[PDB]
Design a protein around this ligand. Sequence first.
Ligand SMILES: CC1=C(C/C=C(\C)CCC[C@H](C)CCC[C@H](C)CCCC(C)C)C(=O)c2ccccc2C1=O
Ligand code: SF4
Ligand code: SF4
Ligand code: SF4
Lengths: 60, 73, 80, 41, 143, 31, 73, 163, 741
Amino acid sequence: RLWCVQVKVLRPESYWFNEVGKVVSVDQSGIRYPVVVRFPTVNYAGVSTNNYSLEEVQEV
Amino acid sequence: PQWVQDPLHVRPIAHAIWDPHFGQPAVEAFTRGGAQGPVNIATSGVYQWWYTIGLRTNQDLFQGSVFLTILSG
Amino acid sequence: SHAVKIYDTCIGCTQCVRACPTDVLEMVPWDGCKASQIASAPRTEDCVGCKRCESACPTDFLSVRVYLGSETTRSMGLAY
Amino acid sequence: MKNFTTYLSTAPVVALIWFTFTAGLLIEINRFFPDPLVFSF
Amino acid sequence: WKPPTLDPSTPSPIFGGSTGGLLRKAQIEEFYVITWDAKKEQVFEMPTGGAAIMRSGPNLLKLARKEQCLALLTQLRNKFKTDGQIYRVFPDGEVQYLHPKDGVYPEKVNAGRTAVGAKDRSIGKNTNPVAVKFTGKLGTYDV
Amino acid sequence: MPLSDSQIFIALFIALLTGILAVRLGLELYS
Amino acid sequence: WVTFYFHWKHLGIWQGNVNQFNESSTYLMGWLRDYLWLNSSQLINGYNPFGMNSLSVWAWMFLFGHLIYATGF
Amino acid sequence: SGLTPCSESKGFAKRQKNEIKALTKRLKQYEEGSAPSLALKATIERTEKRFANYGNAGLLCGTDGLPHLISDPGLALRFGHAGETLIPTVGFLYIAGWIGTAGRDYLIASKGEAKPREKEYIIDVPLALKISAQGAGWPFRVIRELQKGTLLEKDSNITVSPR
Amino acid sequence: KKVKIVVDGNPVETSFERWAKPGHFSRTLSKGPSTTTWIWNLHADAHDFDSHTSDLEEISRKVFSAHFGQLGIILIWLSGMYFHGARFSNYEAWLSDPIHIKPSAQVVWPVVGQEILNGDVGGGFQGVQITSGFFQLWRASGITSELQLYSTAIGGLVLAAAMFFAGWFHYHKAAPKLEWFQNVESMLNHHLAGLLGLGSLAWAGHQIHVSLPINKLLDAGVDPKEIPLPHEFILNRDLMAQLYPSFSKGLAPFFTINWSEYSDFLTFQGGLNPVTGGLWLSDQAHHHLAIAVLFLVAGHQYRTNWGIGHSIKEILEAHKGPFTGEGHKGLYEILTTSWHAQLAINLALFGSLSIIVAHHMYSMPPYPYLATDYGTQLSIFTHHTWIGGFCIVGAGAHAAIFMVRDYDPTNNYNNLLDRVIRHRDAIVSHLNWVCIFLGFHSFGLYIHNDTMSALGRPQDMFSDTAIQLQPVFAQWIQNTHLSAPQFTAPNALAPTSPVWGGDVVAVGGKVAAMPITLGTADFMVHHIHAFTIHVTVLILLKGVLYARSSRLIPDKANLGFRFPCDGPGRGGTCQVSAWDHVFLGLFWMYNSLSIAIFHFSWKMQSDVWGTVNSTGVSHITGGNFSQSANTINGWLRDFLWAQSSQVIQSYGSALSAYGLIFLGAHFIWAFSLMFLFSGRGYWQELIESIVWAHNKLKVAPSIQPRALSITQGRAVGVAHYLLGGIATTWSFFLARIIAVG
Ligand SMILES: CC1=C(C/C=C(\C)CCC[C@H](C)CCC[C@H](C)CCCC(C)C)C(=O)c2ccccc2C1=O
Ligand code: SF4
Ligand code: SF4
Ligand code: SF4
């Protein structure tokens, strides 16, 4: 929820499930997936960022 | 019955061959010096099984075949 | 025809619409993402099933999904 | 010289040097001790 | 905005013909027509193979598939900066206007469009296939 | 001892009855 | 692999030459030469320019299976 | 297993005699002191030494006259065949644990750098040589990490697919 | 306008900075890896210069310096071949006895028992028998000592270092500009008159002054140590005139146009030297002199700087007709701006040339004692056939690359290229019908024969003793070429080859060459060749013609030359790219050339090669080609099963390496099928499980492991398939022909 805070992804279909990423930004306009997370590894599409909801990320 | 008499020196026959594409050497080669015409030598081992379970004649095998056709129906 | 569904993880980047070779997809107004737009698939009868849209989608997992279904002349890409 | 030694540190060059050393060690062991089948002396 | 009508008297590009054009499907099932207004006379690549010369002003090309028309329109928009319109023509003479459907290109968000195929969940929230057995549905994405 | 022609005809008739029953089952399974 | 093992070990046992399997199955060239190459001599001579015999149907099916196998590729 | 020692096996001696005979048959076409003659004589000497060493090692020979290895640690220890499989097993396991521990230590050291992927294809050769030399004492460190619980990543920190 | 030297001074700094940065040449790859795909992408894109930059000048400079590097590598390889002949060979002993001594120039070290490969090749020497034919080539050149082979090895390494210097120099110091490379008229003039013409003239000079007298003394029976050195023939004109009396007249007959005085060493004999079984060296000297004059004339065609000459653009633009639209207009701009179109043309012609070379070298053997060295003959035929087929497939590949990348419809309106694209459906459909017809009426003849033979009806077969298919056109051509010295070439003493007819040329009791009669089996196998070549052409031409678009994918050019598919839609679009057409054409070229080399091996073993005794000629397989090559079973038994006995019983001999390579190549071919039959999704999921195991023990790499890409999976599969099959045939051929030859 903070800036540049380690979070653990709880989305099961995510490539980075049970992995730790860095929060880039949290949108405050009430969108469905406001937490932007940067990961040190790429997924199968070569993407390093994904958007998650509040319940899908756990601060670590 | 011929296999029953001599089980160690008779090749068991699967079925007869009727192929109009056969040449004459093909007819004589698949006859194997017998009188039943061109035949296929069985590899399934049904002769040994049927002999072991007590079948002896062609009549017994024919009766079993008729009974199994009735069972299938 | 193939079934194309859009899930609410769409960020409205319009890449799937630009990737589509048969004009199946379009962006409609929305409020669930920052870009204020979501992809929609009103013309799935023209979908060939190439899955260029899924290749273009940046979300993880995909926001646009193509499920291959019953095949027609348009979905088989036949010019004859 | 730093760039040249960095090139020598790349994975295929390091693999070539290491496998040359290992293959040479095995070859010279089998030359000095021909036909080793069992651990017996 | 209103959907444009197809003018069948529109001149065709200068083309010597090819073996890659229309087939029996055009006469009995459907075919497609792309129209565009060229700024100048220039050579473009046919989607069915070969080079054609588009005439200055309006142009009309009949193509077997919608994908061929959209590939040609992508070439026209990217290379010649020319917009175009794509129609579907049926053997009875009925003409269905296709692209751009509301006059705005689909990549640009336009008001008055309604989302179809939208699911109000992430893709991992789809149910199990055992839950849609003997229901007649296409799959877990259909519920 | 070889079979007789009448035995082969009897077997063929029984197999024809079995084939009729097979066609009946195939039609019932189809609809 | 299983049926190759069964057939070669039993072929050596049936021919009275147990040492053929024992001295040639330890290396793969032994398998190739002393099982596939050696035992295909009668099969591929089922028909030749000099004539045919009763193994000609098996030679034809041998080539038939090679052709069907290749078509699948 | 019904085998006989190779030092008293007739097939073993027959094989040595046949191999020496074939090499000597090849030897008689060359003049004495020439390079092929010297090479064939060296091969003959190596053949004799190899057959003598295999006989002296206590190897068991089958009916084919060839040495057969014993790999059960019981039969190897109580009948003097531990140099065939058991001692090679210990040696291989030591070297394999050495290689694996050196690789693991290099990967863990490279994980802490600013560009962890850079060290995987441009090798830190001094670091790799230092870590490689430290792999001799791998069983002590590995067993300690196993007892401490630091050898294994926790299941909560490892990605899995949906079930 | 003006042909001149134009370079740029010091364009690229010579430094090791980019050596330390893999992927530096590529914009995408320079950022470093994230996954293991970057490792393969770096090697796959390393030589695609046109992908690195769009500047044609930089591409041309890279191509020029890479060609210098290739020439340096080739010279290193050649110098090593000459050095191994000088140091590790039995070449001098073979010179003293070329019939009973097998050539060998590879010696193995005694370790792990591998010294058994040093076989008793003869000459008091042990080593690996070689089949490259270097000994016969060196003997034909007049080389009589290891010192002369040492000199060529040292001189080759000096020239190799000069080539590597020139590649560094012409890229880093003085790189020519684009207008220098586009002087195709000057390049053609220099490469015809100066490369080929002066090369042929210089080699005619070597043949006349060195090769002719030394080989004349060798065939006269003189010991090689007693033969004078070549410079003795250069300096002493009387020693030359002792063998060729026209040398006493000097150069006066040449300048007074009394050319017929030189008839003793400039001949038109034809046929083979009966002593050596090779072509007459005087014939070859006259051949190379005539070729030199022809190429020196040919190199004065194109206009460069002195008004006279042809402009290639004018010739191309003037050659148009009523059926062909604008004709050859725009081809000059294609062939001066696209390296890929030039590579396609040159690869096609070079590969065809290699195959023609294989046929002409077997039929008219140009080296002494080459023809009776059956291992060398089989090896060089098979080798040059394979090189030709690979180059032709590459021609198809780079034609497709031109079509995807360098084709411009604006510059090609109603020319030949445009009109070919505009009827590609007709071309492909007609070629498809031709391939189906050829497959039916060639392979079905074999199937008919196999069925007839298996049904006990040999009288219903397609054979010489049955329903006959006589190749009457080829028989007429053979009869015409046999009768050529009578009427249509009266100044030729003999036909060009003994294969047309006539007598048997025997050297040392073995057949050098003999008539090759053609019957029903030859007819059937020649139509098999036609069918397989037509199918390979169909695949490669379909790839070229549909590289940019098709009815399935109208924007295929936007997807590139090399892409896996366009998804499972439209029914499924796997392998639509032109690259995948190259991928399938590799298999079909392998099939075609495998049948070609099998036909060569069986036909020469059955009807040409053998021992000439007092009664006649006893061939290696005793003439069983005409009896059994008309069935698939005949091929499988009498060629494959019978002739592989040498490679499967080669264990324990010097040929045991061929048995090991036979097994390993079967393995490699089988190993290829896992890449070809499978797909990368399975392997990626299996890698996910393995990565989990590595993550558990904290040994997961930072460079993330990925399965190979779909295109890489296909490339690996076809590469291992080709390697396994070709090396299987290689070991089988070499073991068979060394043991029985
Ligand atoms: C087997 C297989 C794989 C799996 C193969 C892979 C991943 C290639 C593995 C190659 C090497 C062995 C991986 C490791 C390379 C390292 C550079 C080696 C380091 C080890 C040291 C000893 C040097 C595919 O990915 C694939 C993809 C598409 C179609 C078919 C297939 C296919 O058949
Ligand atoms: S699968 Fe292809 S045609 Fe269908 S919506 Fe996606 S991109 Fe468009
Ligand atoms: S590509 Fe994906 S995220 Fe972007 S608009 Fe389309 S569905 Fe939404
Ligand atoms: S199977 Fe592979 S190649 Fe074929 S369409 Fe699917 S992804 Fe593409």
